[PDB]
């Protein structure tokens, strides 16, 4: 899901 | 009525009309639920093992190398209430925020700790405890040992805060231990900014919070 | 009728006239296998590594290399094998309690050793140093002797050591009587130390194993056992 | 508790 995906690095 | 600590108002990126959720009030809890720093572990002793595994204990776990993990216990603090913000919808997240299906926002992005006694001062810390009451900073994360020999570090995209008064609207970074740094050279850079000494992680009335895809206003 | 792996007999120090707390204990094939075998290695307090120690349903062994590192080797179920444990403690993990016969300080470990017996013929029984506590955890502290193996694995000695002398060194054409040897937490053979609890390990002894023979003697530093058996290495070619 | 004591070094 959207709320369970992993936090993407902005760069 | 309970004590209101303050309200978080989400600033929307849409250019839609400001909505009416977009607001969340923080209220003094019936029993304290805040935590404070405690025992440091350098190896996988049974006590460090408990702290990570036991879901009644809080831990923050700093990954230094394949061989080394520092596990720091967070014990109960009766003076303070703890509120967390993030993309996840799980039990730990008092206020779910959303991009305005890949997300730069953390599931558990930050915690606000509020003193339960007047004047109810609110402080922000990067990262939030998950459902195992655990925080993890991986090997690639920016971490360091402080001058008194303690661990500290920054989340991947970091937590950014703007204060209305000092102590020029300038963004600062907030570390997992509540210290204040100048901005990185790029948002995800593995190198921390320079420590800023006078400013603190206290949320003044009208402070701005940036969570990498969500900006939030704090009113007192 | 259950398979009788063998019988342990206490060689009483007192010189008096010779059950779980009695002087003889037989080891019998168990209804469901309870043996463990080596498994996943952890080198830092990762959450899985933490699971291995706090989960009281998982065996694990913790090797304290340094103030900054302890290594957690898991052990998982082995359906082919039965495990038995000897020691000073009276808790449920000890299958044969053992006391100081020299007659609250004791040199005998609460969890002295484990004996692991095959469930199918020849029912060979092997001996290992130290046993698992009520958390299913074995601990080898900083001061004890450890090393990395050829396989690059952890191994170590208890403090006072588990000491075994077989009737024979092997079953070959150069076979000789057996001498007192040291067994590790992993069952490898080493020559005796210079003092009992000395930090330096003896030298590796190849060829000889931890396969108990009929007549093997097990010295647990303050208790001595005799292994008697109709099965295993001593009887099958 | 003789059973619950800690294993002392022989040396």
Residue numbers in the entry:
A (entry chain C), D (entry chain D): 1 to 11
B (entry chain A): 13 to 32, 38 to 117, 130 to 196, 203 to 255
C (entry chain B): 13 to 30, 35 to 119, 130 to 263
Anything the authors wrote about it?
Initial maps phased with just the molecular replacement model showed clear residual density for the MDC1-pT765 phosphopeptide and enabled a near-complete model of the complex to be built and refined at 2.7 Å resolution. The N-terminal fragment of PELI1 consists of 16 β-strands forming four distinct β-sheets, and a single α-helix. It features a central FHA core (residues 13–48, 97–156, and 183–257) comprising two β-sheets (β1-β2, β6-8, and β12-16) that form a β-sandwich. The FHA core is split by a bipartite “wing” appendage consisting of residues 45–96 (Wing I) and 157–182 (Wing II) consisting of the remaining two β-sheets (β3-5, β9, and β10-11) and an α-helix that separates β3-β4 and a large insertion between β3-β4. The MDC1-pT765 phosphopeptide binds in an extended conformation to a positively charged pocket within the PELI1-FHA domain, formed by loops separating β6-β7, β11-β12, and β14-β15. In total, the pT765 phosphate group forms four hydrogen-bonding interactions with side- and main-chain atoms from Arg104, Ser135, and Arg136 located in the loop separating β6-β7 of the FHA β-sandwich. The phosphate contacts made by Ser135 and Arg136 are highly conserved throughout the FHA family, including in RNF8 (Ser60 and Arg61) and Chk2 (Ser140 and Lys141) DDR proteins. The PELI1 wing domain does not make any contacts with the MDC1-pThr-765 phosphopeptide but instead acts as a structural support for a large insertion between β12-β13. This generates a shallow, positively charged platform formed predominantly by Arg 222 and Cys 247.
Pellino proteins are a small family of RING E3 ubiquitin ligases mainly involved in signaling events downstream of the Toll and interleukin-1 (IL-1) receptors (TIRs), which are key initiators of innate immune and inflammatory responses. All four members of the Pellino E3 ligase family contain atypic FHA domains at their N-terminus with conserved key amino acids known to be important for phospho-Threonine binding by canonical FHA domains. However, in contrast to the canonical FHA domain present in RNF8, Pellino FHA domains contain two substantial sequence inserts that extend from the FHA core and coalesce to form a wing-like subdomain. RNF8 itself is recruited to sites of DSBs by the adaptor protein MDC1, which in human cells, contains four conserved Thr-Gln-X-Phe motifs (TQXF motifs, where X stands for any amino acid).
